[PDB]
Amino acid sequence: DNTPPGAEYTIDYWIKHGCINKKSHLLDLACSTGFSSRECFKKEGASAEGIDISESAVMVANEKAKKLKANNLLKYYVADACDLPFEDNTFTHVLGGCNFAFIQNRLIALNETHRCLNHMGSMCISNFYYRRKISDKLINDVYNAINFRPNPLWTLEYWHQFFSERFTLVSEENHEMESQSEDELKADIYDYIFNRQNVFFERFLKIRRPLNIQRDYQGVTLQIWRKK
């Protein structure tokens, strides 16, 4: 899929509250196949430079840009967020999405994005966060499931602390998530595997169960952060 949490809704939110327009020049951070910037272009005509660690992904992003007749406005490169190949004051906006929860050195990365942003430039975020205290067992379960132990202290306050050193919170919209019933989950997994095997089903279920359970403690925050 390669999209931010909320997909088009998130993009729309960013465009509205981030004030993205045709004059904007966006940094698509960890762009993958370039969905976010491409959507911003299609919707608003904004230009963009995207970076990702995956060469193939970048190539897909570029080809898709080409097919859209927009490769003069949308360009993608292989790079790490911790070391951006762009000059200071290059961008009016950074599309961060949920990527600060996954990139290797997120403060260094944050400082780089800060560097590359224009004066009064905006960071556009869509992060997962924990609204409730979650037991260690479930964290361990998720770690086991997908080899990526999340931090249960990644709350709103934590993110605010993280971003507020170099940025001003301009806008915030929080969406609380909730678990599916085993039946619904199984229905989705089944539907997907069989309409888009048993081994696959069992593996998928095994992996997704804890992720599903985790949702009752989580939320997604959409934020606009202004450079200060």
List contacts with another protein (CB under 8 A).
Answer: 5-6, 9-10, 175, 177, 220
5 binds, among another protein, Cl ion, none (CB under 5 to 8 A by kind): another protein
Q: Which of another protein, Cl ion, none is residue 105 near (CB under 5 to 8 Å by kind)?
A: Cl ion
Residue list 99-128, contact with Cl ion (CB under 5 A): 105, 107-108
Backbone angles phi, psi at 72, to 5 degrees: -85, -10
- Residues 133, 152 contacting (CB under 8 angstroms): yes
Cα dist. 32→24, 61, 97, 164, 202 in Å?
20, 7, 12, 27, 28
In the complex, least distance from residue 219 CB atom to another protein, rounded to whole angstroms:
9
Question: Tokens at residue 68, please?
Answer: 């859209």
Task: Identify what 59 binds: another protein, Cl ion, none; CB under 5 to 8 Å per kind.
Answer: none
Q: Does 193 bind Cl ion (CB under 5 A)?
A: no
Q: Is 92 helix (H, G, I), strand (E, B) or coil?
A: strand
What single-letter amino acid sits at 224?
I
Would you give the binding string for Cl ion spanning residues 66-105, x where CB under 5 A is met?
A: ---------------------------------------x
Map residue 65 onto helix, strand or coil: helix
Question: Among 50, 38, 43, 51, which Cα is nearest to 22's?
Answer: 43
CB of 22 to another protein, least distance (A): 25
Binding site for Cl ion (CB under 5 A): 105, 107-108
